[PDB]
Amino acid sequence: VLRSSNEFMRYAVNVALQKVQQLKETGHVSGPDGQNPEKIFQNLCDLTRVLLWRYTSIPTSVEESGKKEKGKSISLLCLEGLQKIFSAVQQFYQPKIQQFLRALVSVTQRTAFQIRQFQRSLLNLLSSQEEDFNSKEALLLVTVLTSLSKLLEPSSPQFVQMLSWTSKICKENSREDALFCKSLMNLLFSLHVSYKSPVILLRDLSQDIHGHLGDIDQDVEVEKTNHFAIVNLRTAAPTVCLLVLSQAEKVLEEVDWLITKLKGQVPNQPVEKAIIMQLGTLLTFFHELVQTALPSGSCVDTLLKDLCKMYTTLTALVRYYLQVCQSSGGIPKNMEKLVKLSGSHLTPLCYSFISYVQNKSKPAVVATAMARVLRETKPIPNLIFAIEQYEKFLIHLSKKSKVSLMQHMK
Amino acid sequence: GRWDQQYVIQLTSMFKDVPLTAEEVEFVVEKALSMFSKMNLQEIPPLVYQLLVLSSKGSRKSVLEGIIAFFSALDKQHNEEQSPSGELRHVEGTIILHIVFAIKLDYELGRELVKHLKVGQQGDSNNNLSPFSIALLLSVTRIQRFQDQVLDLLKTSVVKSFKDLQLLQGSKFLQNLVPHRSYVSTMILEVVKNSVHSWDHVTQGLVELGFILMDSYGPKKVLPSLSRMPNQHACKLGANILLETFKIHEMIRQEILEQVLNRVVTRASSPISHFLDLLSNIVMYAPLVLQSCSSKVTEAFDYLSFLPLQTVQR
Amino acid sequence: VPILDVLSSLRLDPNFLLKVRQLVMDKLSSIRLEDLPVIIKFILHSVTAMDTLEVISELREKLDLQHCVSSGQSCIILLFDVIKSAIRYEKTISEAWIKAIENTASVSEHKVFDLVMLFIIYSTNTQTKKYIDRVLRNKIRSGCIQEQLLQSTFSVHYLVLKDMCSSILSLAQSLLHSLDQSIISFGSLLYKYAFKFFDTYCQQEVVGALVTHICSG
DNA sequence: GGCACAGGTTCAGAGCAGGCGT
DNA sequence: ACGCCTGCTCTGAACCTGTGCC
């Protein structure tokens, strides 16, 4: 009687979505036994069992619905309801996440067993169709994986194979949708960093970006799809740009904190070597981005801003070596190396890119226009400022450790 | 030359009356400090007193650096033995009190203490401060001049404790480098655990401190991660200190309760979830209490028409 | 009393309620003592953000504490408690109290209540600590608040102030660090009364802080 | 041509980075 | 070089446009 009417079903679905959304906003939902957390925990898990089973038992490829009713596909909605459940149990019932997976041995093994299902579902979604793929259901599978990924223990085998698989999906598949691509790379980094520094990764993305977008000089050979496959004309240009430089920032956040704690002190030698190795690797990252023909939005601003922040960390570093190097005779071949590349490869290409972007010149409320353009005129100078203040502490360094570091600089 | 272990204190009471330079007083007291190691504990306090009254015309940095570095080592060794308590608590205390009665007459003593216990850069705060340094500070909050200065340091440090560790626990690169030195909530709580042997001065500072953190970092952004979590975490702490404090010190748990009620009652001008959530777990652990504090809940009810509903309910 | 309850729980015009509020305060002289408390709460629930000085000013004049004399002291305590609970809960009231004492710096005949309130408000409310001490110096410099007041406060209102032990002495310590023997005289007399009337702990704190002066000051 | 989601934009203020008196 | 004041940077909220689809 009820199974015949499809509308009746997508009612009692929408109802369930409304209940779980209500539980997020206030610690409790609407009706009776909607305050007693025990009973809500009971039901959530009892709802979960069935919603999981529907999606399991019935895929989205068995539809006879068309676009209007695939916008509210009974499959799709049950994954959105999953997403909020997995979400909002971590908000409240983080203790009973074991009892929660006992409904579906420690927490991590159950995690993996439950992951594989969605993983394979997503993979079948993606691999099968190209033409009119489920953007939404693929994307919020990605979102459920993201939410739940954070319950794996970071040294567990299941975490390792997750990341391997994660990066492997990013390495293989085409997938023209950018918000989709955005979500994957986000998940990749969020997983990756709590195993190690994500720096070669940033390098790799920049080399592919450099490959795809082209180059400033209008004659440099670049193509490197080989690294990571989910990077496009459309995708990398506004998006993987902001994210790859976003992830560089979190590098230099850590590096600023490193140097603050180091200058407190005066163990040291390994930490300096580590910092310089970091900086050297991501100076290759900055190299590939600079050579790129970056568009003129937040993409260009966030490169130039992060070149400032690269140079500012290099300023804190050089001014650090001045305090201490007077006492011994310091600057090991580590720092000489770094300074060499920051002069030889980095600084002059900073100039050729900013000059190219400002060379690039191809209805306006007067007040708003004045406010906008004189805001946007700061960062070409803040880069020339930041470079010349590097050169300052390098001339200071040259004198106050007895090494002429201006023999490198042009 | 070697000092008669018996009357080393009496020898150090003689350089009290001679006029000396810095180098001279420094030499004599750093030897009197080498001598704490090779003694019974119960005679260290009066020796510390006769060091401080000498240090009044000599080195203060040195006197208090010595007492701190010594008890820091002591408490760490007591900890890893646990992994002589019922008297180790008498000494730490009697000392904090003996250094109190001096910073009372010697306002420069306090300033040198405080300078010594600056965060500044967070790398000095991961070699400086302690489970003993902090009982000492949270006694010091009783001096009228000094309350405020002290608290402000503790509070601001508290946050960094969350911010280092939070930014640290984002990253594996950082966890590789730093060998994780116990963090600042832990320390403050180990004070509270120590507290039992009833050095009841520290308590004024705790309670003062505790509502400072929640009143400071309360939910009001919520009617990010950066400006959210190390303020909630801070709030949690406030709450955490007081509840643990309330469990231990039967004397205080009248005026924890009133000081809560105060902030609960007339507001909902500002949000107060946190205070009710504490108020729960206070009364959940040992609600005999409100039988002793009955006048005060009586005169929370005389505002229970003006109070908004979600508050009144809970 | 009950009338007050009823007119609180009926459905009315505010100007009417104001009118009757004054019909109290004109006869606030004339309440039987037991009943003082219960009124005063109403008056301080009958406060808006804008009604405040007016009402406190009249009341601050109207209220005696001299007139009111074992049930007496109990009822007085009840009083200060009720006030205590009010002032607890309206930042507007505490600040405004003090603005309507310092506007009565002019008549050097202002009364006992204008201490006891400060000390209370110092103890109770902390945001004001600087402000009471500013006012107390500025007012005592002026040839207002003196001996005859401070003597009278601690001869009858010890049991009120017993509680505010630490409050009096935070003050006394603030006053002796000054110039102007007028001020320091007051800060001393503070210590003498503090030590006469309070607990043994207060006595210890007196001699504690006296020493602190003697060795530093 | 109207109907609808996404972007960026201006705001509005919290809360701390850093120039400037003794 | 420590204390005091200000103004800048972040952060999210809400506003309304701007452009894609049927």
UniProtKB/TrEMBL annotation, chain B:
Q: What is this protein called?
A: Fanconi anemia, complementation group I
Q: Which residues does UniProt assign to the signal peptide?
A: none
Q: Which residues of the full protein are shown?
A: 167 to 498 of 1328
Q: Which residues form the FANCI helical domain?
A: 108-194
Whose protein is this, by species? Answer: Homo sapiens (Human)
Q: Where is the FANCI solenoid domain?
A: 202-314
